[PDB]
Design a protein around this ligand. Structure first.
Ligand SMILES: Nc1ncnc2c1ncn2[C@@H]1O[C@H](COP(=O)(O)O)[C@@H](O)[C@H]1O
Ligand SMILES: Nc1ncnc2c1ncn2[C@@H]1O[C@H](COP(=O)(O)O)[C@@H](O)[C@H]1O
Ligand SMILES: Nc1ncnc2c1ncn2[C@H]1OC(COP(=O)(O)O)[C@@H](O)[C@H]1O
Ligand SMILES: Nc1ncnc2c1ncn2[C@H]1OC(COP(=O)(O)O)[C@@H](O)[C@H]1O
Ligand SMILES: O=P(O)(O)OC[C@H]1O[C@](O)(CO)[C@@H](O)[C@@H]1O
Ligand SMILES: O=P(O)(O)OC[C@H]1O[C@](O)(CO)[C@@H](O)[C@@H]1O
Ligand SMILES: O=P(O)(O)OC[C@H]1O[C@](O)(CO)[C@@H](O)[C@@H]1O
Ligand SMILES: O=P(O)(O)OC[C@H]1O[C@](O)(CO)[C@@H](O)[C@@H]1O
Ligand SMILES: [Mg+2]
Ligand SMILES: [Mg+2]
Ligand SMILES: [Mg+2]
Ligand SMILES: [Mg+2]
Lengths: 327, 327, 327, 327
């Protein structure tokens, strides 16, 4: 038997004895993801280059892919009737959903990640994280500032050679391939685990001058293992969804450490760092800042940043050992 | 006026007063790429996961993505009645087209490049090179053993977030964006030129222990620049087509130099290095082994390898100088 | 706010305080419908004409569109875990679902209707009807023989210029357009009603020699109104989903009466006549055999036939009056 | 060997030693049809129902399906640099192409036929006719006023369950099936001929009160055959392209004769009757007004009408005889 994402969500929802609100939320985000998909693969681009004529602009003015993505997400989610607060890397402040549509959930997301990679046609993705609104008082940005450990569900869609949605909840990580022919996500990999140890390290080595001595020591090892083993391969697409997914599937390690110009890392805690740490932990891997677990940070600002190192348990443990040795 | 690859090729072919053969070939390649695109993006995969069960395929039958790609390109090209010799990365020997389907052109291609990125859903592409037959002899491999400078047409398809076909001929390099909604490649950038200088270097640094003194020195310069400039960013997707395109479009530099596991480099000269060299040069960029222009190497083995350094001219020459110096 | 079919079903299911079994059933049938869609619009047909080569057959042997359609339906439904008995115009006997997958519902369907229209590329569709298994004893074909009035839900998908799914349940009829770009059904028409009286009659007049005096009288009227009003237009696609849908949307009347060679009508009670009568009644229209309501017939055989006349209330009432006058 | 319309047109064009102009035109038409197909099948309609909300279109802006079709065909054809005069059903006057984009061909087309079937999702199509300029004069309407027998190429696209492009030139009629998955029309039937005799008649019988004695008599014969044969089946989709195609492929007969509301018939001679007449005759069939071959009528008004009777030869002549007799 074949399992579509829609079917899976409904079962999980049925097992968990949900009132159907969370299920609706995931169906929506699934719908959202499929629309972004289409916009990202450039369907109907021929209209932007005057196939039907009547055209005054080869210009900025039309939505960039990012502004489109954000709107799809915001709208589709609001329309699920399951949210009360949304946070988006694209909006300075949290969106508070009108009372008429207010549901019990909070969502943090990055509508289109790997924007540096958009123009070159590289892989780009969508990252989400969902919390249960704990507080009883009016919804506000503070409902977003819950540590990673409170995630009910988190995941990403990767728009690469093909589209994949990865979804992580309390009992594990599942990969659904997208068949755009029928517009359905198929479960192709179940109860996903990352290998204990990989043979690939990912980090922008252009920052070598800015790295702390640990990162420096670690990278040295991978190239010149003291034990004269085979050196790790390097890979860095420049899009976090692409680099992280490759990590989940092939194993190894991904780094975005603090670097002297980015004393607090670059990636965003709530919609970039959080979801991924959650996926990595539910998959048997680790996610640390170098000195603590991402999931445990008590966030203070919805666009706060954080260093992050995630991936195969042994590969990260090895770097945490270098850090403690750097006392 | 919107331009479609079909119209571009026909137009160019008319200007050149061609007899129609090479146009036919180019339309074929184009048809083939569309086909591969579909497979790559996994449309119809639901039928691999039993959506209709298995009674369907009486057979033992299904295709790896790479094999399907190769059957597509072969059949499609053969079908064009324009080729006589074909070289695929996938076959041990040049393929000699049957007399009935034989045309005067020689096509070297990699039907699906970046295969270590296939199972992670990272970017992949198809790479092609076209020549005119240079003998009156029965067609054989000798006909595919020409130097890059004799190419008539070469380019690639990048199956990334969106799909792009880049085509290079004597008069320059044009990029066509695939609009899957209506099945057409739309000319989106015309008579393309690479930035003289770039800000990104692209190379698998895990082979550090194996690089020659020049690549090593050059690498240091990008991380710790002598002018005390900002360092270059690093990007290495793992897929030659994806990494090379980002280079053409943002500028900078891509490297795959020699290493002990490969002394003569990794990438293939005929269907990998050659075509990308032809695009780079038509785009105002440089393509060297570090000692020679890649396009001037007269091959002697269809699966021969070569070291490749390509990208923006100031960048490649800065490295060529490092070589010239050490020598 | 936009309403996808998936979202609608989940709400209705939520209101009705369902245990989620029926919802899953509709999600499945929705998935089923989307797959048939793709097969019907001939996606990937290029493989049937040797685009990738390797081909021994321009032949029967591969599935006809019908055999594919049936399998998609059967499988997808069984996999919803909500059915215990299925009836399909394509299977002599009812399918009894294995206990491991046995759910509480019964489904009667015609995977691809308008098979006479398949070769000419005319509109073809899918028709379904769902019952609640009433009996407490082992599931068997007798669970299918419930009169139309017991339908929990019924509808059809029309594969025409565009794909539409029409769905009818206790509180009304809703039309969802299919956006194959995102693979979603959008609610574009809500709480649908048929107009009281239309200006189009549909029936195969080739059978004029076989018709009863009522049908004959009625057709006379439409052409030569005694009251010297404008005569009705004629329309008959030859595909029941296409003709019926046009009736729902534009109003008027559709006929498939008994004709001397088909003394019991042609269309099938359970998967052809039933669902449509149900849609028509929930839309304010009528569905009679000429002497009684379709929905009220107590069926005796799962492939039993029945005459049927459906459409605008006044238009049908007019023909029921001719019948009683023909005493 | 699989044949794609792109390859078929190029091949045919080479055989004819054309200069490439007419091929370019044909590729354009083909590109246009793909475009219309997308619109017709409602891909991206979700964006009309606020999937991303409305901030999107700052405008007052959206297109009826018929208008979009007409903008596509015009722009696309213009863009081919092959046309000088265009006649669209949608415009009051012939369109004279600007001197810069002017080619030697004249195109008459109906960009979306069967519009009373549009809102019911029934089959619709595009119909085209191509001529060569017959003067040395400044191009004007006079150039579109040629008899059907001077056509160079004509055909249609049927947007039904699947999409088919049928193309007719001096050497015969070929059908290409659209495979939306990869955007290509595949030649599926070659050098097509209609059955000499058919078993289906197609006509709006609501105009019974208005038909001439011959159409009436012929109609009776199909329902009550004098040889006491089985009666013909009836089929009238309401869309000329859909009804005519079924005719070409199953054989039989299609009629749109004179009625008081139309004395000179309904269908247009230039862009409706002409092209379908050209296909029918190339396919071995007949196309009469009832008094003349349709192809021999020299038009005097681009939007002129004509009665049309077409189909299998034994069928049309049987009716022509009824006419000859009454006369
Ligand atoms: N589809 C689902 N998948 C997993 N857990 C769910 C689902 N629906 C509900 N739950 C669980 O039930 C809680 C609330 O249910 P609800 O009222 O449906 O949102 C969530 O916080 C989850 O723990
Ligand atoms: N999605 C739904 N839409 C409409 N009615 C429903 C739905 N789900 C359940 N129901 C009602 O609840 C009954 C059984 O619910 P269930 O156990 O979910 O199948 C059905 O017979 C319907 O009357
Ligand atoms: N579509 C095209 N684009 C660019 N150069 C072309 C094209 N077609 C032919 N050429 C030429 O490259 C050639 C080979 O010619 P032919 O045998 O006509 O295919 C020269 O004939 C030039 O006309
Ligand atoms: N693709 C084609 N299919 C059929 N006939 C064609 C085609 N192209 C041109 N013809 C011709 O119809 C003509 C008009 O020629 P041209 O000016 O070359 O477009 C004659 O030249 C024939 O060669
Ligand atoms: O150029 P840099 O600093 O390596 O940025 C790459 C990172 O930037 C981001 O785009 C920031 O959102 C991530 O997706 C990616 O990991
Ligand atoms: O791990 P490596 O040696 O960098 O391999 C990367 C290269 O391998 C290939 O997959 C082999 O062609 C190229 O696409 C890519 O540039
Ligand atoms: O040729 P006939 O008898 O009019 O058949 C048309 C009818 O046949 C069917 O295909 C029978 O299933 C219906 O879809 C349609 O109404
Ligand atoms: O209702 P009527 O007059 O039969 O109209 C049907 C005809 O009208 C049109 O829509 C007008 O072109 C044709 O496609 C079709 O053949
Ligand atoms: Mg990001
Ligand atoms: Mg390769
Ligand atoms: Mg049927
Ligand atoms: Mg018309």
């Amino acid at each position: 038997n074949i399992v579509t994402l829609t079917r899976f969500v409904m079962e999980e929802g049925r097992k968990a004895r949900g009132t159907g609100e969370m299920t609706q939320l995931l169906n929506s985000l699934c719908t959202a993801v499929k629309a972004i998909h289409r916009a990202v693969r450039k369907a109907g681009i021929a209209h932007l280059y005057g196939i039907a004529g009547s055209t005054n602009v080869t210009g900025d003015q039309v939505k960039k892919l990012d502004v489109l993505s954000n709107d799809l997400v915001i709208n589709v989610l609001k329309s699920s009737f399951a949210t009360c607060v949304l946070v988006s890397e694209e909006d300075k402040n949290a969106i508070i959903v009108e009372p008429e549509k207010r549901g019990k959930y909070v969502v943090c997301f990055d509508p289109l990640d790997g924007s540096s990679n958009i123009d070159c046609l590289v892989s780009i993705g969508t990252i989400f994280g969902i919390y249960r609104k704990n507080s009883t008082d009016e919804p506000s940005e503070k409902d977003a500032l819950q540590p990673g450990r409170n995630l009910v569900a988190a995941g990403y869609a990767l728009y690469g050679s093909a589209t994949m949605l990865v979804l992580a909840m309390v009992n594990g990580v599942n990969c659904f391939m997208y068949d755009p022919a029928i517009g359905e996500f198929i479960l192709v990999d179940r109860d996903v685990k990352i290998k204990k140890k990989g043979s690939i390290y990912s980090i922008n080595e252009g920052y070598a001058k800015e790295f702390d001595p640990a990162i420096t020591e670690y990278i040295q090892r991978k190239k010149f293992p003291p034990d004269n083993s085979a050196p790790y391969g390097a890979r860095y697409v420049g899009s976090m969804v692409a680099d992280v997914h490759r990590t989940l599937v092939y194993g190894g390690i991904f780094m975005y450490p603090a670097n002297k110009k980015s004393p607090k890392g670059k990636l965003r805690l709530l919609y970039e760092c959080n979801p991924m740490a959650y996926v990595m932990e539910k998959a048997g891997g680790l996610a640390t800042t170098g000195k603590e677990a991402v999931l445990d940070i008590v966030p203070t600002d919805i666009h706060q940043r954080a260093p992050i190192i995630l991936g195969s348990p042994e590969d990260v443990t090895e770097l945490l050992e270098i850090y403690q040795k750097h006392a």
